[PDB]
Symmetry: D3
Subunit: 161 residues, 6 copies
């Protein structure tokens, strides 16, 4: 079977990232900068997921929404038109989700245990780049590169200075 979720599904560095968060927070706008930044859009506002394996989930946009993105202030926008074929992608695996929230103090998952992170929304923060970094990073670990390793490496430096 399949299901539907809110949020926009972009493709960053070939990494399926599903941006989620209470309406108005800035998911469509952020996905627009990401697309403008060379990344691929799959689904905006509403996403149709269809689990492929027991560890791999796929998402896509409902037929009507294809190649489209709404943005409070300009309304519906065809990214294919404005940016060319490299701004859209039919389907993709959701390898990570980013929940855009707001403010408080501070390795989650979701609907079929999928890597998830939550970033706060506040003045002076480019969500587009933070999501770009979030992806680069997630990808970096998969290869073994971790902040912890570098951190353990720095610690030696002192001990053995």
């Amino acid at each position: 079977e399949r299901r539907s979720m809110h949020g926009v599904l972009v493709d960053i560095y070939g990494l399926g990232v599903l941006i989620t968060g209470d309406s108005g927070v800035g998911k469509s706008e952020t996905a627009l900068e990401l697309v403008q930044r060379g990344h691929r859009l799959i689904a905006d506002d509403r996403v149709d997921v269809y689990q492929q394996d027991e560890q791999t989930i796929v998402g896509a946009a409902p037929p009507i929404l294809s190649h489209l993105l709404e943005i409070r202030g300009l309304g519906i926008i065809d990214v294919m038109n404005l940016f060319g074929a490299g701004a859209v992608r039919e389907d993709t695996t959701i390898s990570l989700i980013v929940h855009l929230e707001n403010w408080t103090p501070d390795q989650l998952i979701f609907d079929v245990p999928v890597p998830k992170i939550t970033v706060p929304v506040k003045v002076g923060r480019n969500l587009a780049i933070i999501i770009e970094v979030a992806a680069m990073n997630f990808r970096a670990k998969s290869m073994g590169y971790d902040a912890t390793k570098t951190f353990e490496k720095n610690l030696n430096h002192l001990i053995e200075h």
Copy 2:
């Protein structure tokens, strides 16, 4: 004759765009990122318009303001100095206006019926790119490409799936 208006007049993709909005909203700052992004500045803070035809209006900066842009925090700035000749332009036609506002719920015009749009200002929104998109888009339509057409095209897809 001629007249003067508040707001900054940038040139995006050869498209005269006049950014307007209550002081402090971020018109000069936004025009600074647009310039840094390769677009041309014509007039900042105050613009002198002089209707050419009955359908074409032109705008320019008062002599003193030439090549200058003020920014709360750094004061007056000469864009010619910091970015070179490609960051400034003497005059230009105002083909579109963008009114930067704030928040509520939701094809206007103005002083000689000129295409106009209003975008809300709120955390997580790169006004510079939204204005860049606004221009690309306005330009796209003039060529026939519309979200509606793509939308009607998607609708068929289902009907004739």
Copy 3:
């Protein structure tokens, strides 16, 4: 001797810039976009300064923090890993400081009279580019190019129009 300060120390255009401001304002996030924008990180959150001359001060990161940057939402991040060698620098001279504040109305200095500027934090303002401009500008003056000169030059224009 030496001392320690809060704030992040980036290197922009070979210009040592120390970003300061009440926690949460967005110094680490902003330094992350600057790094992503090709600039070099020296120290994040905490900086260790060691005056070289009576006019030249140097700053560096405590051994553990080396190559690292924390960001509310992704935690500790190794910029060397994500961006390569050109995103980090061991030490550097602090030629300018930028204090990120908020709101009110409106050529300072500090601990060994060092050029300083204060920029307000508010929606619709890319601190990363403003700091980039701040640096370009500071650098421009050192070469004689000033807004004042251009301003005096524009004034003639009228007088001798």
Copy 4:
């Protein structure tokens, strides 16, 4: 009336530039990097000019060639498809022409006295950027900025050192 010419007509910085030169030299390929670099394509391989004034000439592509560009190795290419609306433009004024030649030693014009320059083709030369510079420059002069002026300015420096 109208006429037709060989060469590709790109739009750089809103400046109509008609690239010409013996087949195989690299006009289509170069116009492809320029388009990829954010500039607008008007006509490739063959251009249809139609003088507007006695000082202003306009050029456009024959209907079939619209939005297309051939490239030895990939054949016909639709730039609208690959790059979006901002990669094409219907018509434009030819303000400058650049003749791509080869080698020898060293302010021309043409068919209705139009500013013209000739650049040599040889290993280690990015024609795309040289044409970009050629345009920026042509534009810079129109505003008064000239190498000669800067040169006369440098000369004083010594005399009055």
Copy 5:
């Protein structure tokens, strides 16, 4: 089983592209600009392919060559070091091959019928961008966008002008 081939295997837009061509032609250098341009390197100079399905082939670098790239003039280079994690990728599917040749006049395939194209090497041609375009294009077709369709569309224009 598996096999080995000459040429470099880059990842462009998530598209496995295997650049081939007589030594000295410029495969490593070109892959270096592509990496510098944000694309991922998998294997340089020598590639180890291992067919996954009967329609899908995979390629990777021999253990020693990992993260490395030789360039006549600088010798061996670690792209991970210079550009960060986003410049390398362990393995990938070879969806297309580009054979860099030279000169003569003018839909091939190879070892398990894989889409292939041949581009000529000659002054005034940025192989990096042509390969970038080659990929965008190959990808564009898979989605239905073709030069032929646009061409048939232009033809109507006249017939029904």
Copy 6:
């Protein structure tokens, strides 16, 4: 005392690089792409060096040549005009030299033992990026990152696979 040399002196990543090579090879053109790429020009065609220490040499342009660059096809060019203050720099230390040559088969130094490398000039090679890499690399080593280390690291992989 002081002396003069041929070649152009650019500043890449704050690294003084002196490009040398038989006239016509493409030093000025290459330095033009580097400047366009955000790097700083110090001296073109002719450089005036003045040894500071016994290990540190400085170079600058003769007063007349200041801010200027000649390019076969456009003649003298003022980079300050076309690109802004960030395209020029008064003086700088020459930390590396790159000799642009041509073709044959294959850790030098010079006039006060200065790190030197020689790169071949041939179709399909972006000298601008190779020089950019050359600098990043030289800089990377100074920090300990070497291809050899990564190479020794890869070798273990097999031995201890």
